[PDB]
Ligand binder design. Structure first.
Ligand SMILES: COC(=O)[C@@H](N)Cc1c[nH]c2ccccc12
Length: 220
């Protein structure tokens, strides 16, 4: 399938990314607390539900939450400020809490069932979020005796995610803190604005985009 793109809500950020986040890819967004990475996650979970002319892919969402950062009220707000129905938007976000790293990996494995179910419907899964990719791994695998297994498990996890992205034409979006992935680093700019920097993209130039966080989520 042709690669599809989901608008981030920000024209600047979309430009940096070549149009938006890609299906058949993992986009990995790094940032410190308050950087905007989870806000971007929330915005994408709304945008993807729009038609292409509006920057979406008429898709459903699956959201794996490792540290209780998903806010249904923020989804409703973003939806409403974008002229959407907050109840319908929330209904098309399948939510799963991951309690630990094993469970997180299991949830990605299990997600394929729902992806298959929705695949040839009016609302196929088009966005799979893992927020965050590494919190459990960092918490559980401490020190050098643990690094080998941590890296192995994480590698397997990323491979499972790539497979779903490629096989089912889904944009995978994961958050992290400091191929395989398209890496974007968020930082604080001036006057409350945020800055995204794209690094080490094989086929997009490095660059920066300045964006805002508003009642619409992310936008210029
Ligand atoms: C196949 O999907 C399901 O059976 C969902 N009822 C539970 C689930 C599994 N993995 C997930 C990932 C994200 C959100 C929900 C889930």
């Amino acid at each position: 399938a042709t690669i599809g793109r989901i608008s981030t809500g920000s024209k600047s950020l979309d430009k940096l990314l070549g149009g938006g986040i890609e299906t058949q890819a993992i986009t990995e967004v790094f940032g410190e607390f308050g950087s905007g990475k989870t806000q971007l996650a929330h915005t994408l979970a709304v945008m993807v539900q729009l038609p292409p002319e509006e920057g979406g892919l008429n898709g459903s969402v699956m959201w794996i939450d490792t540290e209780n950062t998903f806010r249904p009220e923020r989804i409703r707000e973003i939806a409403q400020n974008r002229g959407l129905d907050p109840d319908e938007v929330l209904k098309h976000i399948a939510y799963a809490r991951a309690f630990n790293s094993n469970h997180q990996m299991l949830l990605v494995q299990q997600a394929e069932d729902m992806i298959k179910e929705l695949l040839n419907t009016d609302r196929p899964v088009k966005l799979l979020i893992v927020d965050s990719l590494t919190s459990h791994f960092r918490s559980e695998y401490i020190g050098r005796g643990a690094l080998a297994e941590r890296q192995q498990k994480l590698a397997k996890h990323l491979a499972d995610l790539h497979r779903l992205a490629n096989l089912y034409d889904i944009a995978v979006f994961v958050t992290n803190q400091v191929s395989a992935t398209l890496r974007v680093y968020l930082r604080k700019g001036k006057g409350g604005k945020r800055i995204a920097r794209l690094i080490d993209a094989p086929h997009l130039p490095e660059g920066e985009a300045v964006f805002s966080i508003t009642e619409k989520g992310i936008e210029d």
